[PDB]
Amino acid sequence: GAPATVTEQGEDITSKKDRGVLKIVKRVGNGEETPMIGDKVYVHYKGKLSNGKKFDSSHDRNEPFVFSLGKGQVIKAWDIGVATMKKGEICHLLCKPEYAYGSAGSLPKIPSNATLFFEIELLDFKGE
Numbered sequence: 001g002a003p004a005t006v007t008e009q010g011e012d013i014t015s016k017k018d019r020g021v022l023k024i025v026k027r028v029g030n031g032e033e034t035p036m037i038g039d040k041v042y043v044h045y046k047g048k049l050s051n052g053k054k055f056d057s058s059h060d061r062n063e064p065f066v067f068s069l070g071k072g073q074v075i076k077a078w079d080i081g082v083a084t085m086k087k088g089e090i091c092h093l094l095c096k097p098e099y100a101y102g103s104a105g106s107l108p109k110i111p112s113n114a115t116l117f118f119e120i121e122l123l124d125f126k127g128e
């Protein structure tokens with residue numbers, strides 16, 4: 001399925017080239033600009049632990065998920081992944097534990113050394 005597809009075909013968007021964050025563009029966005037570090041970003045997302053045990057969606061709260069890019073308010077894989085997106089784009093992001101919650105995890109929600117899958121839509125972005 002989608003997680004197996006991104007695990008084998010996704011573009012490695014990490015700086016170390018360690019395959020820690022893998023990406024596939026599923027819906028091309030509009031405009032050639034991506035957000036800058038510090039920008040406020042608005043997304044919709046559907047996330048799960050790679051093994052189908054826990055799920056979380058911005059849609060569960062009936063509102064877009066808002067955060068400041070590159071500030072460490074979300075896991076590393078999100079700060080790296082959302083920075084590559086254009087407005088209106090939908091991507092699939094596979095995140096290894098080194099760019100997510102690591103060996104410590106985030107109990108009770110996330111176990112030790114967990115891989116996470118996200119389908120993210122970048123709705124909009126604006127400067128500081």
Ligand SMILES: COc1ccc(CC[C@@H](OC(=O)[C@@H]2CCCCN2C(=O)[C@H](c2cc(OC)c(OC)c(OC)c2)[C@@H]2C=CCCC2)c2cccc(OCCN3CCOCC3)c2)cc1OC
Nearest residue numbers: 047048049054055056066067072073074075078101106109
């Ligand atoms: C710099 O490192 C970290 C920074 C932040 C965190 C906390 C977790 C972060 O969640 C995330 O970053 C990701 C990506 C964005 C959507 C939520 N995320 C999740 O993993 C989900 C998630 C949602 C959660 O709540 C809906 C969580 O509870 C707070 C949660 O706790 C670990 C994790 C999981 C996705 C897979 C299935 C289980 C749930 C999160 C969850 C919920 C809301 C968040 O809001 C961030 C933005 N605001 C901005 C305004 O000021 C407060 C922060 C962020 C851990 C960090 O590392 C240890």
